[PDB]
């Protein structure tokens, strides 16, 4: 759910972090 | 009213980058 | 000798827009 | 197998085709 | 007219297809 | 308020690819 | 030993922005 | 002829600028 | 000064020019 | 809200490329 | 035999990502 | 010198970091 979460507010790097294999 | 196109594509740039070459998935959907 | 690195940034683009806000992994391996 | 088959040759639209969900 | 029509709404592939020579 | 200059730059990459190495004119107006 | 279809879209972008919001026209041929 | 010229060589600002409307 | 003015409002040429060394 | 942190990102593609190759410095400040 | 022009706009995308909002400098020189 | 090191060979993050002001 990316599509919801950073395009309403940059998410943050860690959370970013947790969607790479 | 366009964005969510061009808004999606901002952020696949920013992602395959923070893995560094490992490899990544992008499946919008609730 | 830099160039998959820079290779594999041009497909991505070309990738998600294929599909036209569905969905794909990109998952580099033999 | 994108990596080893369009960074080599520009694969059609058709094999780029059978890579989306 | 891409600007007038893609912009408000993105266009289909095949209205996008009748911009290519 | 900018936003039209920048959803005509997000077209010009998707309308190039989709001829395929061909030709295109990009002309806005009514 | 792609380089001409990459090559072609490094030039498309920075071509409509000379412009200046104007219009152009993109032919590749001999 | 732009394929033609600067592909090979980074085109002037000059010679990019005749080829705008 | 470029995001309080460019962002707001598509800054000409000449006003990007100065910008450059 | 974001909006900014794009909008600076469509600057500086369309900033070096006016200079040509020369340089130039990016710094958002009042 | 471009190839540099396209390489330094592969990293000023990659550059200014990497701040977050703070500001760099791009001056290619020995 | 970032053209003379990423452009032959992606930097590190930490080397790239270390250009930033
Ligand atoms: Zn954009
Ligand atoms: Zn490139």
Do not use: D, W
């Amino acid at each position: 759910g990316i599509v919801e979460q950073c395009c309403t507010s940059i998410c943050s790097l860690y959370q970013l972090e947790n969607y790479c294999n | 009213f366009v964005n969510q196109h061009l808004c999606g594509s901002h952020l696949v740039e920013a992602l395959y980058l923070v893995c560094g070459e490992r490899g990544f998935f992008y499946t919008p959907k609730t």
